[PDB]
Design a protein around this nucleic acid. Sequence first.
RNA 1: UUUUUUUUUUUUUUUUUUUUUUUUUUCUCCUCUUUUUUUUUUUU
Length: 54
Amino acid sequence: SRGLVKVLFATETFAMGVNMPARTVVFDSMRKHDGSTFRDLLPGEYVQMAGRAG
RNA sequence: UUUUUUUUUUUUUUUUUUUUUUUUUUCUCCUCUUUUUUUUUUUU
């Protein structure tokens, strides 16, 4: 919150919704592990993960 | 190359009292033999 930490590594416990967004967001993978079907992401998830940068 | 969420040890406390040991049965009941009754007296 106070900006004293630069690089953060987080799973979906912090991704899909937050206030106080940083400037940049990066994705290290294209897929995800839901409840044992091993699907890929969908626009409803990418909008939330990437929609908080400003 | 396997993410996200599923609460926990019932609440309460600042009520008066002018009595007194026990406690409650058992029925009438043939006494055998020398006597009148001796007696003063003195040594404690």
